[PDB]
């Protein structure tokens, strides 16, 4: 967003530098907002903005966009993760295990080279983590498939 307020040109007599209780003022100036914007700090000045609650609506609208990363209904999308559920999610595991072969065949070339150059070139290549997340999808494998014992039986 942004904020602007026109200072009075009739104030050239008196001083141009209020206010008092500088709390929101000195905190509003930062970043100092570039140059061309604060080039307007002459003849203009910004104003502070705070979000008032209204917590109930802010909380529901919070969960409204949380439907993206959580789930659509908080049920559907990860029951859609129970729809696919390894399907056709092993195809991306085959590409992940192709990322296993690809990335880790050049990861086994790294520690030998570390012994040649003696040692860290800073580095590391990163070439770290990664498929640990694939194993977190394996936690989706074990959990949601363990739900089958609850689904199938009664």
């Amino acid at each position: 967003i942004d904020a602007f307020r026109l200072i009075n040109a009739n104030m050239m007599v008196l001083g141009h530098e209020p206010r008092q209780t500088t709390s929101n003022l000195g905190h509003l100036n930062k970043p100092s907002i570039q140059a061309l914007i604060h080039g307007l700090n002459r003849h203009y000045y910004s104003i502070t903005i705070n979000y008032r609650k209204n917590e109930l609506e802010q909380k529901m609208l919070l969960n409204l966009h949380k439907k993206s990363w959580m789930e659509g209904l908080t049920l559907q999308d990860y029951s859609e993760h129970c729809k696919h559920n390894e399907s056709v999610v092993k195809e991306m595991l085959e590409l992940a295990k192709n990322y296993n072969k690809a990335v880790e065949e050049e990861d086994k070339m790294t520690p030998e080279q570390l012994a040649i150059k003696n040692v860290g070139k800073q580095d590391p290549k990163r070439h770290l983590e990664e498929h640990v997340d694939v194993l977190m999808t394996s936690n989706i494998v074990q959990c949601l498939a363990a739900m089958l014992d609850t689904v199938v039986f009664k």
Binding site: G15, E17, P18, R19, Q20, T21, T22, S23, G26, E55
Partner: protein, 806 residues
């Protein structure tokens, strides 16, 4: 495998078996392991007279197997033949297990508190006092009082204090050891209350122990009991000490309680000592005679004339160093700077009028007639609001009819401009007095529905209810926070419901849970100041659970700042550990955490000369952000308070760094505000006085802590910088002998004159206007040997003490 002999019936083979055990068991220590179940045949048989020694050897194999509490159980069933013989090392282990289990069983039974208590065997407590005969016969008081603290019981401990010889005063500093390691106040005061009684039964009376209980046990009837015994004893000269310790180091309601039961010569004396008027007049004479100031720095800040934030800057800085002088030349020396004042500037301008006039209760009202809160209606009206604010800064703690003089003016003139500093004057003057009508007339005043007056009635209602832990007051403050649209009434009531609870420890945690669990950031910050004032003086980790948790996972930097600032409030008793635990916490990415942590290290170690805090504050003033350098300037002036160049080398380095950044226009106005502010801190009271949050007696100073915690954030409310004047306490040696009469006495100090420099053979001091002194120079000084007037009480710290004519 000698245990196989037990299969035969007659017991004589068992006695011969244990006769084989106790000798060759060195290699057989592990042999009896599997056969312990066969040893149980002897241990469970009552008709076997040697089952005792059977439990001895069973305790030996369990000693080799690593079993401890099991060896203690068999030690109980080992009869008399166990405790009689101690050789090699079997002792230190079993007595460690016995004393441990015993003291934690006593602590277990101490929380009941009474009834249903678990059974205690006579043998395990038998080896308590029996092995304690080693402590009684060898005449070791350090270990004797050690186990006496372990047992958590008042009977055997009453025998430890009853042991022969002396131990003349050693119970005093032993309670200092107790209170240092003390956990809770449950059994603390119960052990303390009997020690002052055994000092009354002792032949030599000592008032420092009843002084320790006066500031620790802190009960209203006890001070009325001991002083009624002083009036019954016809005590005058030597009761002068404990009476001033009652005024100084005890709460206002404590003074109201002792005067209530007493009044139901010395009758006018108790009025003079409890009102503390003589202390104000001698402080006034001490400040006007001994004042050491430098106007050159005030002129270099004067002629700067920067239009931003400088309004409060110079006036609050010179109001600190000049506090109590009444001589003010400021409006004469600086004029055009004061003509630049506008909006809240004239508030602070006339508010400094009360900071520098602090004390001087008599003429403070009529001497301001020129600067009186006019109310000539070319409206400056923050002016006339700050005038009553100035009258409230002087009238804090005790007071007089001027309180009602401000109350009538609150019901008169205009609104809400009067309520700003006026209601602050009404609440600050009634602080700690538990005033009633103020709670009512502030409710109908709270309903006038304005914003800037929000902090006014909030801090006022929080000060009058301080320590009262009332119900309907917090209920109405939390009930008015809904329909109001202002955040200043939320912050004023935040500190208001925070200030009402002081030293509550776990008693306030019921409300602290609700304030912290709530999603309101202002109410969370309210619970931070509330848990700070309740845990002030205590290093318990129950506070640091939620206090530090909201200092971690919270997304709002401001309340997180107030969260890390409470480390200075609660931990101020142990300032040394704060630089170590907050070391990295000043390296955080956001300047808010680096700021509040810098204030934490500043206010916590302020009473100490530790160089580690100054070392960690060195990169703080180098940080790119402005206000973190500012807080680094204020906190660095808090660590150097009264400390000259001989204390730490960074004094003059920071002093020149202050005038440098304020005379440098390139630096930010924010960051340079704490520079001139630091010049006021370091020079506060003309260097004669400083801030003290911890008295020598061991009790925390309420108006200094309350003063600095409301002083924490000066940005939201500029006049909050004036509240730090309450935190200033005089440091001086008062040679008053008694009453009005002033003797002429000079005594010697062993320190070099380099320590006496305040920018050898004997020091030259009053002779009580008293003379300033450093807390580090109080131990080296000695009472005059050849002078006619010599103190009857050993001289250690400064202040006002008895001086006896010899």
């Amino acid at each position: 495998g000698i245990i196989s002999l037990l299969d035969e019936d007659e017991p004589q083979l068992k006695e011969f078996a244990l006769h084989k055990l106790n000798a060759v068991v060195n290699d057989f220590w592990a042999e009896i392991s599997e056969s312990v179940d066969k040893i149980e045949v002897l241990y469970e048989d009552e008709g076997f007279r040697s089952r005792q020694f059977a439990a001895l050897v069973a305790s030996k194999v369990f000693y080799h197997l690593g079993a401890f509490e099991e060896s203690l159980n068999y030690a109980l069933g080992a009869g008399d033949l166990f405790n009689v013989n101690d050789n090699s090392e079997y002792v230190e282990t079993i007595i460690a297990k016995c004393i441990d289990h015993y003291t934690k069983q006593c602590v277990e039974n101490a929380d009941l508190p009474e009834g249903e208590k678990k059974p205690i065997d006579q043998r395990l407590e038998g080896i308590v006092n029996k092995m304690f005969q080693r402590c009684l016969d060898d005449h070791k008081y350090k270990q004797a009082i050690g186990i006496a603290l372990e047992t958590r019981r008042l009977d055997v401990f009453e025998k430890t204090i009853l042991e022969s010889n002396d131990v003349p005063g050693m119970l005093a500093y032993s309670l200092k050891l107790c209170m240092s390691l003390m956990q809770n106040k449950q059994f603390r005061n119960k052990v303390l209350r009997v020690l002052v009684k055994i000092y009354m039964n002792l032949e030599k009376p000592d008032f420092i122990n009843v002084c320790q209980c006066l500031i620790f046990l802190d009960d209203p009837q006890a001070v009325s009991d001991i002083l009624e015994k002083l009036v019954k004893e016809d005590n005058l000269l030597m009761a002068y000490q404990i009476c001033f310790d009652l005024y100084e180091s005890a709460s206002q309601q404590f003074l109201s309680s002792v005067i209530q039961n007493l009044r139901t010569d010395q009758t006018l004396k108790m009025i003079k000592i409890l009102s503390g008027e003589m202390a104000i007049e001698l402080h006034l004479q001490f400040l006007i005679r001994n004042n050491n100031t430098d106007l050159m720095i005030l002129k270099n800040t004067k002629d700067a004339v920067r239009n931003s934030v400088c309004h409060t800057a110079t006036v609050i800085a010179n109001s600190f160093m000049h506090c109590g002088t009444t001589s003010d030349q400021f409006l004469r020396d600086n004029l055009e700077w004061l003509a630049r004042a506008t909006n809240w500037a004239k508030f602070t301008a006339t508010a400094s009028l009360g900071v520098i006039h602090k004390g001087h209760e008599k003429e403070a009202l009529q001497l301001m007639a020129t600067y009186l809160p006019k109310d000539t209606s070319p409206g400056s009206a923050y002016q006339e609001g700050g005038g009553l604010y100035a009258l409230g800064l002087i009238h804090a703690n005790h007071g007089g009819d001027i309180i009602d003089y401000l109350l009538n003016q609150l019901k008169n003139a205009s609104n809400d401009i009067v309520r700003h500093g006026g209601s602050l004057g009404l609440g600050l003057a009634a602080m700690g007095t538990a005033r009633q009508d103020v709670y009512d007339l502030l409710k109908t005043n709270l309903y006038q529905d304005d914003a800037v007056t929000g902090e006014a009635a909030g801090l006022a209602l929080g000060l009058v209810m301080l320590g009262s832990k009332n119900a309907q007051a917090i209920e109405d403050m939390v009930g008015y926070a809904q329909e109001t649209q202002h955040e200043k009434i939320l912050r004023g009531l935040a500190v208001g419901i925070a200030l009402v609870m002081y030293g509550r420890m776990e008693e306030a945690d019921a409300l602290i849970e609700s304030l912290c669990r709530d999603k309101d950031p202002i109410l969370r910050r309210s619970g931070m100041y509330t848990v700070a004032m309740a845990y002030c003086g205590s290093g318990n980790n129950k506070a640091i659970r939620r206090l530090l948790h909201v200092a971690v996972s919270d997304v709002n930097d401001d309340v997180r700042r107030a969260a890390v600032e409470s480390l200075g409030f609660i931990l101020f008793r142990t300032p040394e550990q704060c630089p170590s635990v907050v070391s990295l916490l000043s390296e955080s990415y956001n300047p808010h955490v680096r700021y509040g942590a810098a204030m934490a290290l500043g206010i916590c170690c302020a009473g100490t000369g530790n160089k580690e805090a100054i070392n960690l504050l060195e990169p703080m003033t180098n940080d790119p952000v402005n206000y973190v350098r500012q807080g680094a300037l204020i906190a660095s002036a808090l660590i150097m308070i009264q400390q000259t160049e001989i204390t730490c080398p960074k004094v003059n380095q920071f002093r020149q760094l202050y005038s440098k950044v304020i005379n440098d226009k390139h630096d930010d106005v924010m960051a340079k505000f704490g520079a001139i502010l630091a010049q006021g801190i370091l020079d506060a009271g003309g260097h004669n006085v400083t801030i003290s949050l911890q008295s020598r007696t061991g009790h925390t100073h309420m108006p200094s802590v309350v003063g600095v915690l409301v002083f924490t954030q000066f940005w939201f409310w500029f006049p909050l910088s004036h509240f730090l004047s309450l935190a200033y306490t005089p440091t001086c040696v008062i040679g008053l002998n008694k009453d009005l009469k002033m003797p002429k006495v000079q005594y010697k100090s062993n320190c070099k004159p380099s320590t006496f420099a305040y920018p050898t053979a004997k020091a030259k001091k009053k002779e009580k206007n008293p003379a300033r002194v450093m807390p580090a120079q109080l131990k080296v000084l000695t009472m005059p040997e050849t002078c006619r007037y010599q103190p009857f009480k050993p001289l250690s710290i400064g202040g006002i003490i008895i001086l006896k004519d010899t």
